[PDB]
Amino acid sequence: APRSVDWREKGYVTPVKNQGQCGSCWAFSATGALEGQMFRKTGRLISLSEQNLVDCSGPQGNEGCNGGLMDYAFQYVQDNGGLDSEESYPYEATEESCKYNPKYSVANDTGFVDIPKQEKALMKAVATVGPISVAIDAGHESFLFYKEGIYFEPDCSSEDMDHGVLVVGYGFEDNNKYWLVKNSWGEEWGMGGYVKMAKDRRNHCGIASAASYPTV
Ligand SMILES: *C(=N)C1(NC(=O)[C@@H]2C[C@@H](S(=O)(=O)c3ccccc3Cl)CN2C(=O)C2(c3ccc(C)cc3)CC2)CC1
């Protein structure tokens, strides 16, 4: 694979968003992934409604501001015939009743792909597909106060993930490789909203344990 990849450069990635005081990280990872694949398809980068996901994907298994899965959001989009743009269906950081307007929809998917549970398979996907939804163990306070550099937490779990985020690329700066990850905690956290997560250090924080992307 290429030694470095950055989808931000190719226009696949919207600016950093802020989930606020609602546990909807899964909705940001999913829109992030769909934004990428839609752009790969249409050449138009259009921001997407996390609120549409939060309010409307209960049937598929999601729990609004209490958590959910990226794949359940991707299944919702396939079930629903589409997803509203962020412009039309704005983010409120609260669970309210559903409001999908089929006319205001700018995206769709034909399903999703679950990537094999290794960093090699993740790298293959990131290099060839675009941005990838991933689960990480973000439970450690080191992650909360992350500012710069390659994030390495010795106590991280490869199997116990609690935060959905988006891999937009990877690179290198011993133990010098990283995944470039877009978070949804706004631009004042980490590196303008991003974190470099240790790569090829035995699936650090579980970054390859539940990686997926939508098919468009
Ligand atoms: C985000 N603000 C928040 N975390 C989650 O919603 C997080 C998102 C997924 S995941 O951690 O990426 C994950 C974990 C295991 C397997 C697949 C995936 Cl995609 C689920 N999340 C969770 O925190 C858990 C969860 C699982 C299912 C449901 C319905 C709700 C939560 C606890 C695993 C909310 C803090």
Domains of the chain, CATH where assigned: 1-216 (3.90.70.10)
Residue 193 Cα, ligand 1 centroid: separation in angstroms? 20
Question: Which protein residue has the closest C-alpha to ligand 1 atom 32?
Answer: 162
- Phi, psi (degrees; rounded to nearest 5) at 171: -175, -165
If you search the block for the tokens 């991707």, which residue do you land on? 74
Report, as residue numbers or ranges, the catalytic residues: 25, 163, 183
Q: What angle do CA 144, 148, 150 make, to 5 degrees?
A: 95
Residue 22 Cα, ligand 1 centroid: separation in angstroms? 13
Q: Which structure tokens are listed for 31?
A: 């829109």
Burial class (CB in 10 A: 0-12, 13-18, 19+), 135: buried
* Cβ neighbours for 1, distance < 8 A, ≥ 6 positions apart: 123, 124, 127
CB of 163 shorter than 6 A to ligand 1 = yes
**Which resolution in angstroms does this entry have?**
1.6
Distance CA 214, CA 31 (A): 10
Distance CA 101, CA 83 (A): 9
Instruction: List beta partners, residue 85.
Output: 48
Distance CA 114, CA 129 (A): 13
- State the structure-solving technique: X-ray
Q: What angle do CA 29, 156, 133 make, to 5 degrees?
A: 15
